[PDB]
Ligand binder design. Structure first.
Ligand SMILES: CC(C)(C(=O)NCCSc1ccccc1Cl)S(=O)(=O)c1ccc(C(F)(F)F)cn1
Ligand SMILES: CC(C)(C(=O)NCCSc1ccccc1Cl)S(=O)(=O)c1ccc(C(F)(F)F)cn1
Ligand SMILES: CC(C)(C(=O)NCCSc1ccccc1Cl)S(=O)(=O)c1ccc(C(F)(F)F)cn1
Ligand SMILES: CC(C)(C(=O)NCCSc1ccccc1Cl)S(=O)(=O)c1ccc(C(F)(F)F)cn1
Ligand SMILES: CC(C)(C(=O)NCCSc1ccccc1Cl)S(=O)(=O)c1ccc(C(F)(F)F)cn1
Ligand SMILES: CC(C)(C(=O)NCCSc1ccccc1Cl)S(=O)(=O)c1ccc(C(F)(F)F)cn1
Ligand SMILES: CC(C)(C(=O)NCCSc1ccccc1Cl)S(=O)(=O)c1ccc(C(F)(F)F)cn1
Ligand SMILES: CC(C)(C(=O)NCCSc1ccccc1Cl)S(=O)(=O)c1ccc(C(F)(F)F)cn1
Ligand SMILES: CC(C)(C(=O)NCCSc1ccccc1Cl)S(=O)(=O)c1ccc(C(F)(F)F)cn1
Lengths: 193, 176, 180, 184, 184, 181, 180, 188, 183
């Protein structure tokens, strides 16, 4: 039924798990599609759940996303940094905009691209409508957000802030090897050994 | 052609929303009247809720450029760009009808796109805001700082209040 | 229609029609017609037929101030109905020269409006429509001869008046039945 | 929504730890859900803290006030944690948390402003509804002043137009008590 | 949505403690559900109070009256609690609660007004339907007078247009008995 | 439109043409026909093109541009309100010494925008084409303004707004018209 | 519509405009203008300005055959763009009298179409558009001087040409820059 | 439209049942969420038993390339072989994922059809940004052609020539092309 | 779910190896049919499967996913037309195991050629028209095989919609007989 169930055994008896809750028992979380508040809250809740079950074991965050809303992405980002476990990140398909941000935000040494995934980074997009006074207020805010985002990308990639600023004024696409070279991820996963 | 008839008496009507084509129609009429006689006054009746600033400025500059004085007359209302054009009329020849109202405020706008472009378009509408306030101060006799304070939010003025503010010169009540 | 135009024809006799909803452009058409007529002859009366459910106050006030400004008297004739701004412009006609047809009706009420936005701006716009309301009530008290308080009480909700009741109220001067 | 049958999602899973999420637009039904969770948790244990995560652009004031008054009424402390953003009613409910237990995540943002509204109708009714939203605005300003430590006059000035705050600025403003960066 | 061997949604959990939520617009089906919950609760214990939380902008009068007559018919007291807002029919049902057991949360608001309606058709039918809504208005005013202690004439005057009341004003008017602030 | 001859036709006999609103094929064709007609009435006398436009379609704008250059009379341009994108391009394309801004008009310049949908092969074809158009427009812009090609390129990667005085300094127009002399 | 309009005036100068999408009714206007001009003077050139993205082929062929049938030469002038059928009609002008303005562009490609229905009917309509394609390629070859095989290769996908390239391709004979 | 259940008490939908037998269905257009579901099933199966084959039935008109590549790389990464079976059709990304199956274990049903072609895309915006997005989709086109060459045994040059326009193949033509290894007709 | 204990009436009949194909044929309902056949085959590769068909037809490739599954699996698939079997529905009806294809007495069958549609460059139009003509040929060949009619007869009869009563469908070779009352 759309999402398949699996049957796992006792403890107290047979119990049904949808395929995602099943993978969750293996410390795996999926980030898929556009980033927005509710899908982001779901991810946050999963991260919290997993930290609790075991604050010492790694969490694996698969990312396939075109990007999305920045504040929603930051609820995930700050959770990744806050919880005790390392969050290993794995890009499959693509990680663009906020998707790329969260990918590179993973634990150092534990950020990966699948061989044919692609990454894209760029500056924030936005929009307001209203009085000039309010326009200035909202324009200043998004410039502050852009700057803050550039700083964090600088931190996680190892690139200079100026390098990040220059490279993200317009859409920049990277292959998996180019992403390793850029510092967005640490290596490429090709085969289970 | 009741309007064409009145155009022959150097009367032009600015009615409704200010936008490029109705503004162009006003500009063409002003150019025509100037030509037919550069010495005689032109009368611009204004009844408008406002509209697009660049379209309004095409009228503003035409009003200043041509040789004849442009007398402005507010009937009903002159709001936003409508109030601007009302107050832009020739000194001593700007009028309100007794029950017209005037409203002044700052520019509204909107953009969508990359942050870099958002800054560019924000800087531009802020510059336009600044320029409009300077022109408003110039024509009303109010200080720039006074205009800035009074146009942050919508400000309504009755006809007598508009005379005192310097937006118009007097009220027309009955023909002489 | 009817392409000889029937209105252009009637305009030559200083007859103007205000028909349907009051808004800026039809109001501007009326103002233009009054100006033309004043010029054509500043001493002869103008006849304004009114059949209207009302409309935008500022557009209506462009007609009102024009009526008061020009030198000729504007005789007003209510046909069908004169409601809201229609009733206002009817009673605004030259004293002694305001008429209802026998089966026309008049309706008076307070202004309607609406805003959306910040509370500060809501307060600004509410304050404005209240000023307009007060001003409209003063002008109606003035033209009907009613006290301001009577106008205020009667326009809080829709008030319908027959042609005889409109004469009695002071909205018009008399009823026209048959041409003399 | 991460489902184990016995319909039991990740949120039900987190509720077992007295953690509640306020996410997205504030309105009557999502708020009723929040109130119900707080009532359930209080009973399960009236002495242990409740944790309310907030990620919201704001929403309807009367709905927000259902959550506010419930937060104050129940016996447990409600610790509030801003993630992503807390704007308008979201910021209001955030600062409404138990003193000392209101937090911002490092890269969350807070925004405060005055109420928005709208009416359509007769001038008399317009006036009734305008005075009502002005009364609501005053009440909100008083409560904000109370919870932040700012003066009423300061809140009034600062909320005439949208005001954005970083997490450090929100601490400095008194909206929250501290920034959470890493699990203890 | 939140769940808590056995499984049960949180509203079901609260229902077992005689708490019913009335949230949003009053209409036939949501009203049916409330009536049904009241009956269930009476059976479970005809002596213990029932608590009806109200957060509503109002709604359909006949729907509301199905709740009203049910509140009056059953044996248990129905204590009413306003959270967020109780407007129009929401306010009526709030004040219809058991005397001494009607409450406002400190920052909830109440609004009262007359019925709204509309018909279209022949003048003869227009008269029939106009006469009917006038009868409903009269009855609603009588019952409002009954529960508030206000005179019929005062209710009539006070409800010709929307009237908003703060929680203290609602106690003063007699719509509710007191304010709930803090648990014991 | 008032009669006196419609107001625009009346102005046309005085060699005045209005370019108003978005540039597209049919309004552009109207401009072109007016220019051909005027060239006719007198191949020696100046033509006046008032411009108030947010821009529009490039190929439509180029029909006006090439007509301006082809015909015998000088086409003097006057910006009122605004001249943006293609509107700015046509403004600066006027006869040298006869390009004007009204004092409170504004000018905006940027690169072309476009869009295609289809197979990668065709995307490549259409992408290369708009890139050629971009280069041609920058060369022509450099030509009429006096700016270097490299300068035009850098300044038009994003929207660049100019006041009437700034447009004069940039070389987009020759001077400001303030009062009829 | 600056007025007798500006187009009627230019028509008196044997100038016809083909502007926008090619379809039956605008095409019929062009054919009618050409017939009229042939009449007024069967020996003098007709000037056809073209600014078009293309359009319906049969509609374009009504113009094409009219151009060839009438006695006067039809000179074609591309301003802005001549794409698809627009480019076809440009190149179809009288030998030696086909022009591009300097910054006009030309685009050529194969026909587009679409059908839906039974497989049998799909086959009928596919066969037809393929015949139209072949016929258009032959005609393009004829007017450009290119070989049939060169046209076929160059029009499988959109091919853009600058004004100098269009002269070199044989689509037009020269570039007009300034009037003689 | 409901999914059939079975009682045995306990219950499960037939798809969950087939999943326990290591059968996964890829059906309809390829897009992120259905692709994620396929990825998750593959992960789950690798788990239950990293040595046993996984069977992916494919009936798809194609879809989003990046979504398809999330499946492609998962197929390549996991330890078990992924056998692919085309029923109905495998077009565009569907044909790509079909040919990406474990060598020797890629099948067409007798009346399935396969279609291969180059990527489609579209952008709107400034010329500078148009160039960036055109450059990117051309890189993608190139990468897909290389991978197609790899799995089919065709030369990169042959793949390039054959995919400029839609190319349809019958099941025997798909075997001859190297898209699949054989045709499944009847069960053993 | 409609009639459950969710365990609906269809799940109950599935336990008796009865599958329903109802309404328009498209990928997802087809996949559901395929999944049920696979499930039934595994539970018992020797017992017949019963496929009830009431369908106006639908997408050919979706239908062929069902067809090839029917032929691949070990059990015989008996087909029963109720109401109607039109286009792809008639095809799957006649695709059942020979001797085990039935019409109910007042069901009707309709056969015809493929329908389709494309839009684009002439070159691409040719590619897609050639493809639907190949599909048409293959479907005519398969219809001839299962009905016993000559290729020429199928072709002549399917250029336009051809309606058949249940007796006419038996006589045509589309089904083997009519089911009227249960044994
Ligand atoms: C909000 C908290 C309580 C939280 O998320 N708790 C639940 C973790 S999920 C979980 C826990 C145990 C067992 C099972 C699960 Cl799923 S917290 O650990 O992020 C937290 C938040 C705030 C504070 C403090 F600020 F009060 F110190 C301390 N801890
Ligand atoms: C653009 C001009 C020619 C203009 O508006 N001309 C027509 C005025 S309308 C008219 C004129 C004569 C007779 C009848 C009419 Cl309707 S101008 O007079 O505003 C003008 C514009 C520019 C320059 C100059 F910059 F070249 F000096 C000189 N004059
Ligand atoms: C704006 C004026 C000039 C006006 O309406 N003029 C045209 C009247 S219509 C007309 C006049 C003459 C012949 C034919 C017609 Cl239709 S006015 O008479 O209302 C007027 C308006 C303002 C002033 C003054 F303020 F300058 F004194 C003087 N007169
Ligand atoms: C309405 C009440 C009864 C309430 O929320 N009850 C249910 C609490 S949820 C719960 C309780 C016990 C066990 C488990 C759960 Cl989930 S109350 O505690 O808010 C309340 C409301 C009103 C009054 C009084 F006014 F009658 F005194 C007393 N108590
Ligand atoms: C119709 C009756 C039999 C009724 O509601 N019966 C079922 C009550 S719910 C119940 C009873 C026993 C055990 C369990 C439950 Cl849930 S009643 O006549 O007792 C009755 C009950 C209630 C009302 C009213 F409150 F709606 F007016 C009117 N009549
Ligand atoms: C196309 C032509 C004839 C044109 O526009 N003619 C009409 C000009 S409008 C006119 C002219 C005189 C009097 C009145 C009017 Cl409206 S042209 O003069 O631009 C032209 C175009 C092309 C060639 C040539 F290539 F054949 F040399 C020669 N002349
Ligand atoms: C259809 C015809 C009559 C036609 O277009 N006639 C009108 C030309 S427009 C014209 C001609 C002269 C004067 C004024 C005008 Cl507008 S024709 O000349 O193209 C024509 C068409 C067909 C035949 C014939 F086949 F019968 F011989 C002879 N002539
Ligand atoms: C992210 C991992 C842990 C993963 O997909 N786990 C879920 C496997 S599903 C599963 C496995 C066992 C039992 C049950 C299930 Cl559902 S992984 O095997 O793809 C993996 C990913 C990354 C790394 C490393 F980079 F850290 F080395 C090592 N392993
Ligand atoms: C894909 C396969 C394995 C399949 O359909 N498997 C699941 C059958 S359903 C089932 C099976 C066992 C128990 C319960 C159920 Cl429901 S197959 O039988 O169609 C198949 C497909 C391919 C090959 C081979 F090519 F590798 F030989 C062999 N078998």
């Amino acid at each position: 039924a759309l999402v398949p169930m699996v049957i796992e055994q006792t403890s107290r008896g047979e119990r049904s798990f949808d395929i995602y809750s099943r993978l969750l028992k293996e410390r795996v979380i999926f980030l898929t599609g556009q980033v927005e508040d509710h899908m982001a809250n779901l991810i946050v809740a999963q991260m919290l759940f997993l930290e609790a079950e075991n604050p010492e074991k790694d969490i694996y965050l698969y990312i396939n996303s075109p990007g999305g809303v920045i504040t929603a992405g930051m609820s995930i980002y700050d959770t990744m940094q806050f919880i005790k476990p390392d969050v290993s990140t794995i890009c499959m398909g693509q990680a663009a905009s906020m998707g790329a941000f969260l990918l590179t935000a993973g634990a150092k040494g534990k950020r990966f691209c699948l061989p044919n995934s692609r990454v894209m980074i760029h500056q924030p997009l936005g929009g307001y409508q209203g009085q000039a006074t309010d326009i200035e207020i909202h324009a200043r805010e998004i410039l502050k957000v852009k700057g803050r985002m550039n700083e964090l990308m600088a931190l996680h990639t190892g690139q200079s802030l100026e390098q990040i600023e220059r490279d993200t004024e317009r859409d920049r696409f990277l292959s998996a090897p180019e992403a390793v070279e850029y510092g967005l991820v640490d290596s490429i996963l090709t085969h289970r050994n």
